Design a protein around this ligand. Structure first.
Ligand SMILES: Cc1ncc(COP(=O)(O)O)c(CN)c1O
Ligand SMILES: Cc1ncc(COP(=O)(O)O)c(CN)c1O
Ligand SMILES: [Cl-]
Ligand SMILES: [Cl-]
Ligand SMILES: [Cl-]
Ligand SMILES: [Cl-]
Lengths: 439, 435
């Protein structure tokens, strides 16, 4: 009796798929979930697959002299462009670019994909967080517990709506908020915990929800880099997503989403997202104010096209990350670097290794100068280290030991779905070469 | 001798006079501007406006006149320009930041005669960021009218500002400068006039008051693109490029324009996460937003902007045709018509009817003649049913605003509207009012 292998495109299921697509028999046991996110799989999976050749067109003998970290022209493929041009041919003459039926359809599709009853699509991930906090009842002075290593948009969303960030240390291996440091930071002004699934890695949400239940806190998660994570939002009151062009799934402009199972909360999000108006009643305010922060109908139509590539693209990211972890194994075994763990709760938006603090600048310089290999560090400045009057006045004396140590060690290697395996070879070879010459 | 064509409201008025036989000079000179590009394909020496710009079909069968059919606010010609530019934009993979964004800001700068332009994700965001850049702190008071779209007050409230509502001039629908000083308190920091319906507020008088009391002036010109001397007396000028404006993109966008460099710097910092200008991830102020205009929309706007001068002129022609053709209804005192003024771009066309008759007029136009009208906007700021209003604005009376609010009626007016539809609107109004 054969166990079926459900292809949802989610992170846990992709992990089994990786094993099966590596093997010789790829038959009826592989069942493609009837979803828009799986559309590009449908055609690919009609035949037996060799991953290297069929998904990556591996050309080991193609000479490579430069490896850009993130060439944006390669983040969108010719087939996506043709798809998008086709849909726009129909959307443009409708004259509906802000409100419209593609926006509504896009929200339903996300709702089904996320298993969340209500989805409110927004004009950015930053707006989603900001509106989410307000809809959850954030008042000026309310404290929000969060990590200090996220992109600046996370703290800005708290600050913009009047909140007070309270920074807490991360787990230095996962780069996510350490749930064992959270309870320490709770005061009578704490109302929120805002975990970030940094680089695509899922935070320890079950533990976080336990602390939150204990102290009656609300949980809003920044999953802007985590689309595709299995069980996303299971333990959160609000989930926020970004669809900016650099994400695992993005549109052609700024956009994001709020997702929730709570109807009263959803309604408030809608009200905040559109001028404080009663839902579907233009010009009639039912709350003090709101923003102009719904997603555009035009981007929604674009999103319905690009979403067709998501499951395949997340799978290719997983393959790339597995290949890094396996081929670089020796550098970790001998204790020169730390590799991320090949886990089910990661969608590989970014790929972090850790190197020695004292060597990082030189490792980066040598990869670039000697081998044309570009790497990067997301993000260069920690929240409590920003040179702002707020930080200077209120965040002096703060020490986050693990966060600061990890921040000095982390190095991101190129990884995106249209990256080639032969570029990756170059990255890995160069890494072996420069690390060995550090010793 | 030369009749210069800028596309701006004053020159448009002289062009109109000139083309109606009232000669203003000899040689038509089309200024070399992006906003005039499409004018060049239709504007000839012996132009017949009714035929050459409107393709007037006196006898075309009409059974409905929609107030604002959104599919007709973008032409087939625009759709093709847009598809063509997107064919080149899409493969670059640059959709947020990028070179079209920078070019679009440059082009707006030249057109508006403002040194710095910061293109934003919406007009609402432009106002919000402009207020903050100008130094709005929570509790600071902002003098403003109560008859604008809710976006204006929301931009103040979102940053914790405090709206102070003042009465309007009931003929112009704009903030009455003679009611401003009255409302000034030690907490007042800004005046925020609105060029409502596309009518220019009395900015000179407003600036005199501002200087006297050391206030800042940020104007909501989201409906006023094309006004001659827009921003001459303002510290910050805000625009919207939403698809319903005199010029719009294909999504949300707006702009802040200013001549002040330090202000511009602050606007950029607030518009993008509080980062140092052009230096990602390095904050120099406490926080910012994700509120720049998208590169993709700027590519679209660079195409749609080519139709602006032509479209604004068409709006003027329509407004002038309404005012001339409906004259009798005003002469006999049945309605009031807007004044044919150089300082208007006719985003909306407001007439005034009797308070007690407006509902019936609207119903009879629609039911008997399929003529749809509307009222922008249905609810005044101090009459919204919110907790802030009940706690802060209780008992406020704005006599002229409230009266005008009960009287105003908007007639269909947009660049692609037809003269045959307009005839139906006008004959309908005559037949309804007589009866
Ligand atoms: C962790 C994180 N949170 C929030 C955001 C903000 O998302 P958006 O750009 O759609 O505003 C980003 C975008 N880089 C992000 O990476
Ligand atoms: C007078 C006025 N002010 C501000 C705005 C807000 O502009 P946007 O829709 O681009 O946010 C509008 C849009 N209707 C407006 O009409
Ligand atoms: Cl929904
Ligand atoms: Cl730092
Ligand atoms: Cl500029
Ligand atoms: Cl009202």
């Amino acid at each position: 009796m054969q166990k079926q292998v459900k292809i949802s495109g989610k992170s846990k299921e992709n992990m089994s798929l990786l094993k099966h697509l590596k093997g010789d028999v790829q038959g009826k046991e592989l069942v493609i979930e009837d979803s828009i996110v799986n559309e590009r799989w449908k055609q690919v999976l009609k035949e037996k697959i060799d991953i290297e050749h069929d998904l990556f067109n591996y050309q080991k003998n193609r000479e490579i002299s430069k490896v850009p970290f993130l060439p944006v022209d390669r983040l969108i493929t010719n087939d996506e462009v043709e798809d998008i041009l086709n849909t726009l041919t129909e959307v443009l003459p409708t004259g509906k670019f802000t409100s419209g039926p593609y926006l509504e359809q896009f929200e339903k599709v996300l709702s089904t994909y996320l298993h969340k009853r209500y989805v409110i699509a927004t004009s950015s991930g930053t707006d989603a967080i900001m509106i989410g906090l307000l809809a959850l009842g954030l008042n000026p002075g309310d404290e929000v517990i969060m990590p200090a290593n996220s992109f600046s948009a996370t703290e800005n969303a708290v600050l913009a709506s009047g909140g007070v960030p309270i920074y807490v240390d991360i787990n230095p291996q996962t780069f996510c908020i350490d749930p064992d440091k959270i309870e320490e930071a709770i005061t009578p002004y704490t109302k929120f915990i805002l975990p970030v699934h940094l680089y695509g890695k899922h935070s320890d949400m079950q533990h976080i929800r336990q602390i939150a239940n204990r102290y009656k806190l609300k949980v809003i998660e920044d999953a802007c880099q985590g689309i595709g994570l299995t069980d996303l939002g299971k333990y959160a009151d609000i989930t926020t997503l970004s669809f900016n062009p650099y994400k695992n799934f993005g549109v052609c402009g700024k956009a994001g989403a709020i997702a929730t199972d709570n109807e009263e909360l959803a309604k408030k999000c809608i009200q905040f997202s559109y001028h404080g108006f009663e839902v579907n009643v233009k010009n009639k305010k039912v709350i003090n104010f709101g923003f102009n922060s719904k997603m555009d109908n035009l981007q929604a139509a674009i999103g319905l096209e690009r979403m067709k590539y998501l499951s395949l693209n997340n799978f290719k990211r997983l393959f790339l990350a597995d290949r890094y972890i396996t081929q670089l194994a020796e550098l970790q075994n001998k204790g020169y670097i730390e590799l991320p763990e090949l886990s089910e709760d990661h969608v590989w938006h970014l790929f972090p290794i850790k190197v020695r603090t004292e060597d990082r600048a030189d490792i980066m310089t040598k990869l670039n100068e000697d081998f044309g290999v570009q790497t990067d560090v997301y993000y260069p400045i920690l929240s409590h280290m920003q040179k702002t009057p707020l930080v200077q006045d209120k965040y002096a004396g703060l020490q986050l030991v693990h966060t600061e140590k990890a921040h000095s060690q982390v190095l991101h290697l190129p990884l995106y779905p249209s990256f080639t395996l032969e570029e990756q070879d170059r990255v890995m070879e160069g890494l072996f070469h420069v690390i060995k010459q550090e010793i």
